[PDB]
Amino acid sequence: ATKAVAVLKGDGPVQGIINFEQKESNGPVKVWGSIKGLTEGLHGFWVHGAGGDLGNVTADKDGVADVSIEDSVISLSGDHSIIGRTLVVHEKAGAGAGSRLASGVIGIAQ
Domain spans, the chain: 1-110
Q: What is the dihedral of CA 106, 53, 67, 78, to 10 degrees?
A: -40
Method by which the model was determined: NMR
Identity of residue 78 = G
Distance in angstroms (rounded) separating the CA atoms of residues 63 and 35? 8
∠ at Cα 63 (60, 67), nearest 5°? Answer: 65
- Name residues whose C-beta falls within 8 Å of residue 18's C-beta, 6 or more positions apart in sequence: 5, 6, 8, 31, 32, 33, 35, 45, 67, 87, 104
Q: How many whole angstroms from its chain centre is CA 21?
A: 12
- Cα–Cα distance for residue pair 87/25, rounded to 1 Å: 21
CB 57 within 8 A of CB 65: yes
